[PDB]
Each structure stands twice: as structure tokens, then as C-alpha cells.
Design a protein around this ligand. Sequence first.
Ligand SMILES: [K+]
Ligand SMILES: [K+]
Lengths: 321, 321, 321, 321
Amino acid sequence: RARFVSKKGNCNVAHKNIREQGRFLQDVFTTLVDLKWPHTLLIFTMSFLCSWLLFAMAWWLIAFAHGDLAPSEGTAEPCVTSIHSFSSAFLFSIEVQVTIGFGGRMVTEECPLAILILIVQNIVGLMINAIMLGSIFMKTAQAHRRAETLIFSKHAVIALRHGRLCFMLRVGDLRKSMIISATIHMQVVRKTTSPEGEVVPLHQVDIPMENGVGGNSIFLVAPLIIYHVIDANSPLYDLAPSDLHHHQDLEIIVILEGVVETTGITTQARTSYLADEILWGQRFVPIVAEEDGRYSVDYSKFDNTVKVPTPLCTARQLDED
Amino acid sequence: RARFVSKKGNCNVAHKNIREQGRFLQDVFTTLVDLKWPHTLLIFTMSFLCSWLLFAMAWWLIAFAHGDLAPSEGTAEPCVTSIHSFSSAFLFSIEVQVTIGFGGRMVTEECPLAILILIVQNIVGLMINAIMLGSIFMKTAQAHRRAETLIFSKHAVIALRHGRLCFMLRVGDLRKSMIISATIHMQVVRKTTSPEGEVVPLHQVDIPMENGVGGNSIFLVAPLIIYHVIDANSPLYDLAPSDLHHHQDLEIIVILEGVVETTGITTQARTSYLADEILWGQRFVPIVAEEDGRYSVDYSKFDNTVKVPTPLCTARQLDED
Amino acid sequence: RARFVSKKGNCNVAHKNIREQGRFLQDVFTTLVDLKWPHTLLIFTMSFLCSWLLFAMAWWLIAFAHGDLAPSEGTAEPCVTSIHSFSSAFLFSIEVQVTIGFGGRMVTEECPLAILILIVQNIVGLMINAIMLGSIFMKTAQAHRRAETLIFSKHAVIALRHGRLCFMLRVGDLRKSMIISATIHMQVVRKTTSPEGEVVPLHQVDIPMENGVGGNSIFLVAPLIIYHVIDANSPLYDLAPSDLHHHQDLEIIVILEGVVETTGITTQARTSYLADEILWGQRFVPIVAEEDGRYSVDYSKFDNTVKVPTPLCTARQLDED
Amino acid sequence: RARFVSKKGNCNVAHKNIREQGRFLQDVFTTLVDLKWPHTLLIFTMSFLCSWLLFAMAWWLIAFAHGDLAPSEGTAEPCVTSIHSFSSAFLFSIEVQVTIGFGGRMVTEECPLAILILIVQNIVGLMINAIMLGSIFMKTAQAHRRAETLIFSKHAVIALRHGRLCFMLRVGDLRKSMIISATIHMQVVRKTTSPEGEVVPLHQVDIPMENGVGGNSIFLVAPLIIYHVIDANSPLYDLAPSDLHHHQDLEIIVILEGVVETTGITTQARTSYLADEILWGQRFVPIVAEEDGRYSVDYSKFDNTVKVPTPLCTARQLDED
Ligand SMILES: [K+]
Ligand SMILES: [K+]
């Protein structure tokens, strides 16, 4: 009735009553990267513009204190040439911080405080440039968007494979570039009650993906059927074909995590299957076919299935009779 | 007749009928890095040039609306000095965005809209500089080219080792810099039919690499012979010496993945062995030899083999008689 | 009486009598990033300012040797225009290295040594800019601060689960962004004496986290109870409920390590439980609850426990009677 | 007589007769980062200087073809102002590519080819800046220098632990910052002969590190004794106390690999123990001690050992009698 993970991978958690809000300010960079894109553009533009405005007010105060803003000229040279307005000081601060340097307004050697302001503005401008440009590149380069081209099967099935019952699903990579060291973790999530009376409201029990070697590591080029053999040690060992209705406390989440080959940042796609999205007694259709010396996958047939005859009984009363 | 992976690691897949083309636009950065090099240089040059052209048209419209392009001069100062052509506006836009700042054309404090255009151009120029330079460095620094100096054996062998039959091959690192945490995943890929009637067209079954500890983790300095012991749990357990002809549905792919020590980006080399590239009854020649206090590998003898006597029978009828 | 790891993850080690101090200078970059923030800002500002000062002294010596500082002018052009003070040379060095380029002081083609000084200053400025800006971004982007939003239970418990005794604790993620490929390593740290007489003063024995598949890999969205089953192979197999006093040589440290999804840098949080922070005969309260179609965790109830009846005997004399 | 790995981690391999030298040019970036530091500085300086020289020759040819180098002036404006020498063209090319922009030499709107040269120079300058600065930061930031502060024991021992014989050594971290997800791989390297006659000249057999959970993953804060239990499945199972002489074909290499917490790049330290650097019948001294509420390690006592009584027989004739 309320799913843990959405079909696109969004987690439906609320995080209520976080009391220790002070530790959120101990990692400002994670919160800065973790923002939305309008807030990221706003903080980018605001950081640069307020740095320019602060140093513009500094240059304007220097030109005031030297008496350069007053047009009563004698022969003494200003600290900065041709500054006679706050707009002039703002243009000069932009020219210094962006390192444009038009030269209509340049620092002269008259004011020793102006050289200190120039040094401080250059240092803070280099620091702001580094921390902001690196942050915006890290934001536009993070690999959680690569999960958009990692498709899963819309429905999972439970079918007879090699005399056992297996929970099978299909995961496909949509582009040419591989995902390096891809691993699959499937978790049965439901409310469990311990025999001693302990009730775990959202218990996540790992179901081992049948691989052949035991380790969970796939090579994803063609869309391959990831399946878990319902053994005696599996929490689906008492799952019934009539138990796959809606409003059933059972949800199998799948977490595929790897390294994107192009960027190099570790990505993680995830999906979820409720009890009504699990089709008992069906199996996937083969979509890989050889044509003209290459292999071809028909991604339109990705989630198509066929009703094959399986017994309508649990894996336990299949293992015994 | 049509191989899954090429000998150089290219995958022969087609990806037909990708219907959800809308999610390809949800990760624009992966597609941007994933381009070819002519398209990458074209989009780099085009992004910078069109940003300069757009802001040049903006500066030209400002100089038009102020009346600076008209040479009927009075005494009022322009927004930008010495702009009297679209070529002048283009040179000024290049000077602002690249932050050259020659100063023949500089922003004056007359036009308040010109200061806003300067601020917007500086912000968009910083953003474009970050996203483009970081992308081109990430493109020229990705580690999928490191696989060019990770050579594999041209032929794999099947030979008697320690009383068993073992599928052996040779992988060598061609340069001094190591590959950190290198792991080997070998997969037998063929068409399989389940006993319940399910036909998997391209089934990839992991064969465990014999390592001594079970885990697949190698230390690649000298070219070492990676071998898999054909046990009762191995899908090659019924492989015959006469089954190693061409047009035989059997292909063993090898995936070596690690971290490049110099760059730090996870790389993955891969190769493939068809049924005719597997030499029954042969073994590799030793190429490591000590000279003058160091070890030396003769990389010219990399794929040389020698016909040693092995039985001409399957691993099953070797295990029993 | 003296803990190995603090509750926040700080290690209480001293590193006395490090004799080979020469190898600390073989990785200058690790020491540079490893500094505190005042030292980092000081070395940043000092590197830039001393580079500007060194090249300013170079430009001043060039202007001296050409005779440009002497105001006895004829008609010969200077190497750099309008330099007549060390303050002028300093402003020119700042304009060259920061690439501002006002143009009141520009390099002329008269002095061939000035062109060489300009080339050397540009090369060293580009190198210093790269190595300093990348270092400060790597410093502000390192993921050891992400551990501030990875909370652990303040107390751990030992409770009856599924007929066994289990050492349980609770770890929660405080923000939306996941931590990819999170693994948990728990270690019992105490002084051990081998039966042959060998005394290990700080022995760290790995206790396996009960996961279902054996591998230590969690999916941290909701705060989940990490527990280790006290089996016959566990070093807590002889732990008593009366042995959980202070001044007891026993400390269980927990190390959660993963990849931050936003930044991509591997992070590691760690915590510790002394013998008095382990509550025998208690268990955690369920804090996950469904409201309005989503799940919600009450983080104020994070470390609340309830005294449930467990036997007051060791796991050995529970396993037998 | 000739060791595989040096004590500092350098591999003594030669890589003779690399025939496929063409694939070395397919990854130019790995070779560029893989250079020595004098070659890196030389190629950095040479790339920037030759780009400036090439575009300087371009600007000089433009000023020639327009007739600006000829001092026979009329009234027509040059393409670039105040260029009358190749030194002037070189200074202008430096000002354009470094984006200094003094403004004594600025692009005018007279020459349409000069605008194209300016665009091409800006694009190539941005590309060269990205690829060079990122490469030099990646070079100075690579984590193979972090192995200088990961010390190993100078001698390894073989001692009685828990009734078995164990090969023990000591690895210490020299600085405060941890190494995340540190794993240890020990390999016995020697010449082996298969019972079928196959001679492997440098065979590397993995010996499993005794950890408690089986997995090789350490938590390195204090210098801890890494030991491998000589079991029946271990290749040291027939190692004798008299077999630990020099000129004995046996060498145990140790590979510790992890993630540096500060930088985030995966590092790998490695060491080696010949047959004479393995002390039979000795064990390490405890160097961890509690003082004033903290723990302290005496790194001067790092490689000190004590001769404890062990039997002078192999692990096989210890297992039986
Ligand atoms: K400039
Ligand atoms: K200028």
C-alpha cells in the first residue's frame, strides 16, 4: 500500500525529527552539491556577485578615504585610476576578480592599502573560483543520472528453472559504454516478527543472486535475466502463488551498483517489485538474436512474458512433494 | 559464426528498438562524454563560439539602443567604448568571455544594462568554462584506453594441470605502472536450454578462476597464466576435444578490471575465445627468465604453445576412467 | 579506561618515535592536503604571495639593470613600461601571474631577458595555479566530513534473536543522498594472550556481521539494526552479563565504509562501544512507521531501548543448557 | 639471488621484446602521466611554449600579409595594433593565449582573418590549458607516493600461534589519515613444477590471510601483525626451518591496497620477503602501550623480535607428531 522504493529508484522515506541539526553544518560541501539545480545556480551566481559587491564596496571606501571621489583635483595620483562612482568601483572589482583587466581603471602605487585590497581580492577570487567551479563540475558530473539508462523489467516472474523455483527479472543497459564491476544486491523487505517477540517494521533480508560462483558480479552488455533460486535458506521459501496480491507485506528491491566507464564515478540504480508486480507462472521471452554477424536485442520485447506451466504451490511443498 | 565480444574487447551488440529515448536526455553529461572525438571537438568549439556570438549580439543590441553605432557624436559617453561594428562587438565579447581584456573596448558606467550584460556574460562564461574544460579533461583521461596495453593470449589452451583438466590463458601488462586491485571474471557464453524448456539465447555462466583462496584477485606484474579447473561444477565438464571446431555454440569471455595506478580511474579490459581459438592438448611456454639479477619476460614468446600429451576425452570420462 | 576509537570516530593513537622522518618528504602532496584549515589557507596565500614577490624582485632587477628606474630619460624604450618602483614591479608581477593585465605596465620588445622572465613567470604561474586550486578543491571536497551525517546508536545491545544471542546496534543515514556500496566491518578489540604465551596488546578480531548471504554489504536508507550472531566461532562466545562493566578490556569498533553518491569519494565512518555502553538484556524500539503512503523514521527515538527478558548467562552455557 | 619485488615495492621485471609498440600510442595520456618529473616539466613547458610560438608565427604572417610590418604608413589600420616585429607577435600571442591582454597590441576589426586566428588560438589555448593543468594535477596527486608512509616489517617471522605455525609480519601506517578499505594479499612466489611436467618459472600462489571471517580486509590504525596460518592447504605446509637460507627459491610478497582518505585515489603498497628475511622461531615484541588515557606505539621497536621456542620441523610433521 506504501512502497519502500519507487519504480524509478526514489526512496519513500521521511526522516522525521532530526534533532542534531548542528552536524549538518559540519559538511557544508555535501549539502552544497546535494542541492537542486535552481538552488545551485542561485548560490553560484550569488557567491560570485556578492564577492564582487563586497570588494567593490572596499574599493569605493578606499577611493573615498583617499579623496579620489571628490572631483577637486590637484596633482596627486589616485589609488585606482578613473574611479569616480560606485559603478566605477563595481566595474573595477569585476575586472580584478574575473581577471579581465581592461585598464581604464588600474591600481597605482600611491595607496599601499589598495595593494593589500588587491592581494586579498585575488586570493579570495582564486579560492572562490576553485571551490565553485569544481563544485559545479562535480554536480553536473555525478553518476546518479546514469541510472536513467539502466532499465529493469517492469514485472518480475517466478518460474521453474532446473527443477527449482526461481525469482527472475531482467536488467538492461541502454547505451554502448559499459558499467565496470557491476554488482547486484536483491533484498526482500517486509515486516518481520522474531520468535522472541521482536517486531522489525522494515526488515531487509539479502537474497543471494544465483551466479554460479556465489559472488554477486555481473557483466552487463546484453539484457540478462538476474534470478535467485528459492532454496530452503531463502525467505521466499514459503511464498505462495495466491500470496502475490496487492496489500501484501512483501517487496523485493534490487540494487545494481557499478562504475561508469566514461566518467569513473560509482553509480547505483535501484528498483522495486511489490507483491502484485511479481507474476507467478510466467517467464521472459528471448530477445537476443543473431543477425548479419552481430547480436541484436529487441528492447521493445523487454518486459514481455509468457505463461508457462508451473505448480501452484509453495517452494516448501514443492521440495517435499 | 558471430562472436559476442571481439578480440580487442568491442561488444557486437545492436540495441534495436530503444523506445524510451526520452531518458537519454536525462543524463546529458554521459552522452556528452560518450561522444567520438570529432563530435567532442565540434561541440567544444561550437559551445564557446556560440556563447561568444550570442553575447556579441547582446552587446551589439545594447550599442544600437544607446545610439553608439551612429557616428553622430555629441559628448555623451557610450556604454562600451570604441564599438562601431558587429565585429567590434564580437571582439569585445571574446575579450570579456575569455577574460583577455585588451581595453580598447571597455565597459563604462553610462549604461546600467551593460553592467547586467557583463555580469551575465561572466557568470555564463565561468559555467561554460567549468563544464567544458572538466568534460574534455575527463574525456581525455578516461581509462578505457589503458586496456590497449593489457594484452591477452591470442589462443587459450586446455591442458592437464595437477591431474585435472584446466582452461588456461595468459594475460600480460605491457607497461611499468601497475593496475591496482585487478580482478578476473571469466564467463562461458552460449545458448542454453533449461530442462523445463526455457531457452536462453545468450547465457553467461561464471566459471571460477582457480586462485588458491577462491577470490578472483590477481597481482599482474609478470604475464601470468590464468586458469580455471574444469571441475564437476564447471560448464566445460562435458567439453570434448572434437567439440573445439568452428561453428560451435561456445565462447569464453574474459573480463579483467582494476584501477589504473597513474590516473586512478577504474579500467576494464576484455577479450574472447571462440571454440576454434581454444587449443586442446597444448600448454604455454615459460617466458620468465632471470638475467643479471633481474627478471625478464620475452613478450615475443607470449602466445607460443607446445603440444603436450593430454587425453582425448571429456573431463567427465576423465574423472571416471 | 582508555578507548581505542572515540564515539565520533577519532582514533586515540600517539605514533611515538617515528624515526624515518625522511619518507614524509617523499609524499609532499599527502601532507599538504592533510593539514588543518588555517595552515592550508596560510600555505595557499603564502605560495601565491611569495611567487608574486619573487617575480616582482626579478622584474625590479631587470628594470634596474636596463636603467629604467633612473628617471634620466633619453629616447630608449624600457623593457616594461611605466615601472619606476618596486611597488610598480610588484603590481606588474601580480598583473602577469594572475593574468589581469591592466596595460599601464606592459612588456615591450626591447629587453630579450624580459620576455624570458615573462615566459618563466607564466609557466610557474600556471603550475602553481593548477597544483594549488586542485589541492584546495580536493581538500574542501574530501568525504571524511560525510561521516558527520552517519549516526550510530549511542548504546549497543545484546539480545535474544531467533534463539541465539546477538550483538545489535543501529546505524542511520541522516540525509537523502545514499552511500553507495556501504560495507560494515565490526571488530572486537582487546588484549589477548596466545596459549603459547604471546601477548597481543591491542588485538582486533573481525566479528562477521549477520547479513543472510555472509557478505558484509548493507543498503542504508532507513536506520537498520546491524547485528552479529554470537556463535561458537565468535569471540563474544564467553561474554557474561556481569562482564559488561567499566574497566573491562573489551571494545567493539564499527567501521562503515562506502562511496558518497554526490561527490564520488570513498568515505568511512567509525564508532566504538566500550563494555559499559553495551546493554545486556535490551533491544531497540521500532522507529519506522507508515504515514500517508510514505515511510517515516522518528530519529528522536534512535537510541531508545526496552528491557526485554534475556537469560543472564554466557552464550556457551546458553548453547548448552 | 634475484628478487621479484624490492623491499620498497619496485618490481624487478624487464619487459623484453615488446613487439606491438603501436598500441602504446593508442593511450597517449597514460604515457604522459607515466613519465618522470623532468620529462613532465619539459613537456609542460614545451607544449605551452610551442603553442605560443606557432600562433606567434601565425600573427606575424598575418601582419606581414596585411603590410603592417612595413613602416610605410598611410591611414589604414592594422589587424593587430603596434606589431612591427616577431618579438611583438610573440608577446601578443602570449597575451592572447595566457589571457593577459595588456592592450598595447589588440585585435582591430580590419582583418577578418585575424578574428579567425584569435578564435582558433583561444580554443586551442583552452584545450591545452585543460589537458595540461589537469594532467599535472593528476600527476602530483597520484597515490603511489602514499606507499612511502606505509611501513612493513623488515623481517617476517614464523611462530607458534594457537597450536599452529603461522607466518607473521607487521605493517604500520605512519600518519593520522586512515587508508579506507585496506586489503592484504600475500602471495608465495617461486618456481613450481606440475606433476605432468609443466614448469612455471614464476608461480604466484595466494596464501589466505587469517582474519577471522575469511575475507582479507584490515583496519590499519595501530601497526597490527598480519599472519597466515600454515594449514594443509598452504604452500608453506612443507617449509623447513633449515630451508630458510639464501639462494632458496621462495619469496613471499605482500600487497596492501586501499583508498587514501585525503585524496580519494586508490593506492597500493607492496613488499617482499626472501627466504633469509624469514626468521624461524621468533615473534614480534608488543609495541602498543596505554599512557595517560591514550594508546601509543613505539615505532622504534617496529622490527624488533624475540627468539621464542618453536619446534624445528615442518608443519606437516608437526601436524602429525
Ligand atoms: K586578462
Ligand atoms: K588591458
